[model samples]
Target: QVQLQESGGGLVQPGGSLRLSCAASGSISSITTMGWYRQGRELVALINSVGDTTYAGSVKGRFTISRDNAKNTVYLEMSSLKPEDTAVYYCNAFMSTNSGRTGSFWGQGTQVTVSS
Candidate 1:
């Protein structure tokens, strides 16, 4: 059983990049795919895992995710950021299909706002 936590800033200028971090505790050996998500403006963005070090589904070629297994931490980076990207971002663990779980186990989300 593993638990995850998120940490990052809350402010970003328009057109600037946004970055965040997720820290894991309890257990880290069983994790495979780490996922990220955003909920905002009545829209939900699902970011797919990319090679254990990136995430797919970013619109502007501005989103990246990486994991440091040694430290049990994950990093989220989004460049060319915009006001539309303002939302709560979360880190999650991908459960196995045979485990009978469909959906992510998420950490407490970190809110990022784009402004002047």
Candidate 2:
């Protein structure tokens, strides 16, 4: 089985972006969509599949996600970060179902706190 790990700083100054990287082990990067979720929330905020990025319906452009297949990693960038953006962020891989929708396999999250 594969697992994911997140690495990044835990604190971000207000108005700065929060950046995180997800490293994959035991799986190929191209096999699934790299997904991001807000800690303690059911909402999936970002998705990156085959280099294409998508944001959740409620999330704004402030959040951006990207994947690098060569490095087996995914990145999350949240711009103009506010204290409200403080949360544990996770990187995930999706399990594809016959219906064409996907399910998640998550990474241990990295918590970020935005402050002055």
Candidate 3:
């Protein structure tokens, strides 16, 4: 079975920023797309094999998604943090093909609390 572990998220003050990292623990070759989603299951962004990125309109400018193929890692950076941004963030990795992406392998979830 495949899995993902997310880290680097903690208490972030208002107006500050933070980066969440997701590392895949399986065969990275099958990973065609990796994405970040919030508590409501809203996709923050996605990065695919072709290096194409898709972002939700709400996070289009405030969030950035990137990856390290060599390390089998994916990352999400959020800027200008606020209380509204506090939520449980999860990482999803899966294969994308002509039939479209398959079921996502999710991380344990990272709690991000923005305050002060």
- Show the lowest summed lDDT stretch of 10 residues, model 2: 39-48
On residues 1-116, what C-alpha lDDT tens digit does candidate 3 reach at each position? Answer: 46788898999899889999998876566777889889748888999977899998877788889888787788898898879889999898886445574656888889899998
lDDT leader: 3
Off by over 4 Å in 3: 96-102
- Each model's lDDT: 0.67, 0.72, 0.84
Please, what is the TM-score per model? 0.75, 0.78, 0.87
lDDT for 5 (candidate 2): 82
Please provide the root mean square deviation of candidate 1 (C-alpha atoms, Å). 3.6
On residues 12-104, what C-alpha lDDT tens digit does candidate 2 reach at each position?
798887668987776463345777787546454555454767776544677777777777788887777779777787777876655685556
Query: Which is the winner by TM-score between candidate 1 and candidate 2?
Result: 2
Off by over 4 Å in 2: 57-59, 97-103
> How far is each candidate from the true structure, as Cα RMSD in Å?
3.6, 3.1, 2.3
Order by lDDT, highest first: 3, 2, 1
Q: How far off is residue 79 in model 1, in Å?
A: 1.5
